[PDB]
A paper describes a structure:
The re-acylation is catalyzed by lysophosphatidylcholine acyltransferase (LPCAT) and among the four LPCAT members in human, the LPCAT3 preferentially introduces polyunsaturated acyl onto the sn-2 position of lysophosphatidylcholine, thereby modulating the membrane fluidity and membrane protein functions therein. Combining the x-ray crystallography and the cryo-electron microscopy, we determined the structures of LPCAT3 in apo-, acyl donor-bound, and acyl receptor-bound states. A reaction chamber was revealed in the LPCAT3 structure where the lysophosphatidylcholine and arachidonoyl-CoA were positioned in two tunnels connected near to the catalytic center. The structural and functional analysis provides the basis for the re-acylation of lysophosphatidylcholine and the substrate preference during the reactions.
Similar data collections and refinement processes were conducted on the cLPCAT3 samples supplemented with 0.5 mM 1-dodecanoyl-sn-glycero-3-phosphocholine (12:0-LPC) and EM maps were generated at an overall resolution of 3.57 Å. In the cryo-EM map for cLPCAT3/LPC was identified a large non-protein electron density located in the horizontal tunnel with no overlap with the araCoA electron density found in the EM map for cLPCAT3/araCoA. The C12:0-LPC molecule fits well in the density with the phosphorylcholine head positioned in the C-wing side and stabilized by the interactions with a series of hydroxy groups from tyrosine Y143, Y151, Y298, and Y394. When the interactions were impaired by the mutations of those tyrosine residues, the enzymatic activities of cLPCAT3 reduced significantly. The C12:0-acyl at sn-1 of the LPC extends to the N-wing side of the horizontal tunnel and ends near to the lateral gate formed by TM1 and 6, where the binding of acyl chain is mediated by its hydrophobic interaction with residues L58, I59, Y151, I153, L155, and V213. The sn-2 hydroxy of the glycerol backbone sits in close proximity to the catalytic residue H388, ready to be activated into a nucleophilic reagent through the deprotonation by the imidazolyl of the histidine. Interestingly, despite the empty vertical tunnel in our EM map for acyl receptor-bound state (cLPCAT3/LPC), a long, lipid-like density was revealed in the side pocket which meets the electron density of LPC at the joint point near to H388. Manually modeling the acyl of LPC into the density failed to generate well-fit models, suggesting this lipid-like density might not represent an alternative conformation of LPC molecules bound. Based on the absence of density corresponding to the CoA moiety, we speculated that this unmodeled density, in combination with the large density for LPC, might represent the PC product partially bound and co-purified with the protein.
Numbering used by the authors:
A (entry chain A), B (entry chain B): 42 to 490
Write the structure that this text describes.
Amino acid sequence: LARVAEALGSSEQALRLIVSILMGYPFALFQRYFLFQKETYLIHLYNVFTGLSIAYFNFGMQFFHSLLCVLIQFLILRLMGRTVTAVFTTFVFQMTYLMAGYYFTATEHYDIKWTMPHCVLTLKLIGLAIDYYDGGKDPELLTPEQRRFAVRGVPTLLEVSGFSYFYGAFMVGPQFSMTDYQKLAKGEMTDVPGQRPNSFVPALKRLSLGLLFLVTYTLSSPYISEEYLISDDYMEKPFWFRCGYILVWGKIILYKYVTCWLVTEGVCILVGLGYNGNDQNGKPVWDACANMKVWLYETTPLFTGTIASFNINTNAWVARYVFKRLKFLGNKLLSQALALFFLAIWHGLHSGYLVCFQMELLIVIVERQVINLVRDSPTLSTLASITALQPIFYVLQQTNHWMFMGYSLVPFCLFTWDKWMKVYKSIYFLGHVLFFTLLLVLPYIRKLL
Amino acid sequence: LARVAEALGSSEQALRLIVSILMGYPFALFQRYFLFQKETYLIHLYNVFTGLSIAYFNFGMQFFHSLLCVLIQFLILRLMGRTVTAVFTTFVFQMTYLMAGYYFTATEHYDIKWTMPHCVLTLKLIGLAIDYYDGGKDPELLTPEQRRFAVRGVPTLLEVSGFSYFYGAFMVGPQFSMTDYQKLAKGEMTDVPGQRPNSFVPALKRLSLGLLFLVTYTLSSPYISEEYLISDDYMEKPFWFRCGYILVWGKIILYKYVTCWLVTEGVCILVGLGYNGNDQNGKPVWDACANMKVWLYETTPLFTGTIASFNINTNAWVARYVFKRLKFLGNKLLSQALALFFLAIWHGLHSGYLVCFQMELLIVIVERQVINLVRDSPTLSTLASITALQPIFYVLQQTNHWMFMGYSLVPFCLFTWDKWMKVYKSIYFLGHVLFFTLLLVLPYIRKLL
Ligand SMILES: CCCCCCCCCCCC(=O)OC[C@@H](O)COP(=O)(O)OCC[N+](C)(C)C
Ligand SMILES: CCCCCCCCCCCC(=O)OC[C@@H](O)COP(=O)(O)OCC[N+](C)(C)C
């Protein structure tokens, strides 16, 4: 409806996405109470129907495209099951399908179109194929976590269709594995063997936090937007103020993402999929499929402290299915680039993503070098601080972290060859030149000390 | 000059290219008579100067890009000389440079721009890198051709610069190897151990034939052009006539290529680079760096007989450095489906090339299947012919060959999504559907017989 779209002050696409995400709670409540007896095919059909309904509500003309990619893989997965070339052909097919979709969409403004659910689906399917090939090997140890994380059996059409179309983690949801989905289907993922998983208390906290972030972001949205950055006229304000804007911006655009992940956690933890075990005391731990770690993402002066708390899940998937599969190159420095290149193509086909990831690589390397210089061969360095007082150091580090994360996040939201450089040149290319000088000078001063 | 361009009836680019190609003959005549004493650096400097002048007279200010590829490789070739990763990095760098040039250069007409000399240069440099890598291995009993080609030593800047900028084979010239260039530089490519090689008699034939083809093509150029097909008002004559046009066309557009190769052969055979050995009788053989074999390209009813008579210096290079190097994977078909893909990218970035190469692959497979069915399992099918009277079969086969080679060469000269399909749909997609039906039916009828 256009009336509600104009009333809420945002485009109808975002409202439709939010209502689709929020519609998962009644589905989970219905599932948790009417499926005590298993009869797994009921769960599989229910998941398929709910996922198809969710896809039809939003993308109600092109959803059958997804129904293609599930079926074709099932053929490729069936024949040449354990050969190496199956992995190659499925990887190439999925990549070329995604690239064709991206090329034929190629919209300039940020739009929530057909692309993202298919992106999540195709990455999950590649993961499933890799896992099946890995589990097809000999039953020896092979890094026992890898052994227990593999799949053994025949993945018939019903199981793969149900696992592909989970209603909760479909749009932007967390990426689970194949082995644990069958555990949920077979009902061995509960707090105790013979009762419903008691998870009401964890879910409300996540829902409250996600709603709080959502409401504060939508309240603070009109004040700051990615149009003041150029405006063709306001590129004359005092330099410091401009930097201050980049400090206020970036920290606000991130809250657009966070909330949805948090809220989808609420629909993913209620069904019991977020169980991993108990702690030393024995109490249950529900932080298994979490996509965000609040209270560490905020207060983290280190540049590397925002890489293990922001995305966490996709990063873990990339590390597990790229680094562990390219141990025969042996360079140890090429792979860390190649993975990023893959992460620079999975997001999109524009140019801003490459520059953003290059800046992230440069900043993390510089931070590693600086933290290696101190506290390892400090001499005067540590006893100069002597831990007498570090309020000023902490606040300066925090401001530096915010400013130089927003400064590299600018090309993420503006991914055109013209607007990016037009808004980026007014800052005198500060970050790249400064960090290049630091990188080229630091070994010399380290050798001096 | 525009006056000569309008007088000759062709654009100034073609005339400039032809005059540049023809300008090599005084260079070769000067070289053959004033360089009895070797002092190799004189030859290297002469080659560099002549190649740079030729590049200047065609592409005035842009030629430095070519230099920007010769020097960088010399660095990559110097450090990490014998490692595996050197091949990977030089391959990726050359491919991405060529792709960037093509993407920034792409136009909708056939333009003689910066691309082609850089394309030849980059493919030659990739070949040099592969050959140098295959020279640092153990000197065991490899394949004799590998030992005959492998280079041992360190290529300094002068030698690589001279070998890269050969004046004769620069624009569209044949692609020789690295080891034999040093043989020419050291003066051992002669009929008699020491004297000027006797090559006047072989050379004049390649001028007579080349000039004959050139004059016939330029005389018959105005009658047939690639505009009558797409005029959209000439698509209404009866069906057969249209097919007849495709028979007359295609066989004419090919003569645009042939001549130049022939003529550059004349400037490549005079210097003595076309020597390979003697025959059984003992007379010299000069068909070493030939790029086309006339008297077999014309009268060849077989569809596979036009692959060993067209350009046999790029096909041989591809087979030597891709087809017979990816034997570790061991599929025997995927490689045949991979190398062509490389050949589908080296030509350009448009879409017509892929379809043309796919059609060539399909027709050659169909021809192989048909020739396998006959003369191997006749079953009273050919024992009755006994060569009684079959000129009709020969002429029918020749007409079929011409028609279905032109029908697949059409997308080569028209490489846009719109023009190609508009000109191709009026023929009712005859070749693809016919060959698909033949491919799907032939095994069944073979099993029947
Ligand atoms: C209150 C309004 C709610 C707004 C809805 C936005 C949902 C966040 C998208 C998360 C998708 C994802 O997992 O990729 C994470 C990153 O990749 C971010 O992705 P992008 O923001 O660049 O979107 C284009 C790239 N896709 C297509 C691959 C998703
Ligand atoms: C009387 C007038 C003379 C006309 C001059 C034309 C010269 C023939 C080009 C041969 C280049 C080559 O070796 O590639 C052979 C094929 O690749 C053909 O190539 P194309 O015709 O498609 O040209 C674009 C592709 N390049 C850029 C790679 C060369």
